Amino acid sequence: RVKKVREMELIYARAQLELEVSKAQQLANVEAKKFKEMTEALGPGTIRDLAVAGP
Amino acid sequence: RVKKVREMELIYARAQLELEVSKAQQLANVEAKKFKEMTEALGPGTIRDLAVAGP
């Protein structure tokens, strides 16, 4: 009983702890994608000058 | 019972946790699109001078 309850929970938790990583994987892509679509569209050099303004 | 309830919930939650990412994916596009339609329409050089104003 204690074997087939923790062992069967393990294979269940295995396909869920890895399902958890696929969520974070796809959400990391759309974050980096939408980051890329702004950083280059804004300006590779503009980001540099916009931060260094100190006069 | 505990197999076919958590396993069937897994395939259900799988097609929902990935449905969640498609929402964030399309919303990231319209954000970056509408960002692109303003940043270039405003001025690639204008964004640089508008921030560096310090006199």
From Swiss-Prot, chains A, B:
Described function: Required for normal vault structure. Vaults are multi-subunit structures that may act as scaffolds for proteins involved in signal transduction. Vaults may also play a role in nucleo-cytoplasmic transport. Down-regulates IFNG-mediated STAT1 signaling and subsequent activation of JAK. Down-regulates SRC activity and signaling through MAP kinases.
Residues of the full protein shown: 761 to 815 of 861
Post-translational modification: Phosphorylated on Tyr residues after EGF stimulation. Dephosphorylated by PTPN11.
Gene that specifies this protein: Mvp
Domain comment (free text): MVP 3 mediates interaction with PTEN.
Name recorded for this polypeptide: Major vault protein
Species for this entry: Rattus norvegicus (Rat)
Cellular localization per UniProt: Cytoplasm; Nucleus
Subunit (UniProt): The vault ribonucleoprotein particle is a huge (400 A x 670 A) cage structure of 12.9 MDa. It consists of a dimer of half-vaults, with each half-vault comprising 39 identical major vault protein (MVP) chains, PARP4 and one or more vault RNAs (vRNAs). Interacts with TEP1. Interacts with PTEN and activated MAPK1. The phosphorylated protein interacts with the SH2 domains of PTPN11 and SRC. Interacts with APEX1. May interact with ZNF540.
Residues making up the signal peptide according to the UniProt record: none
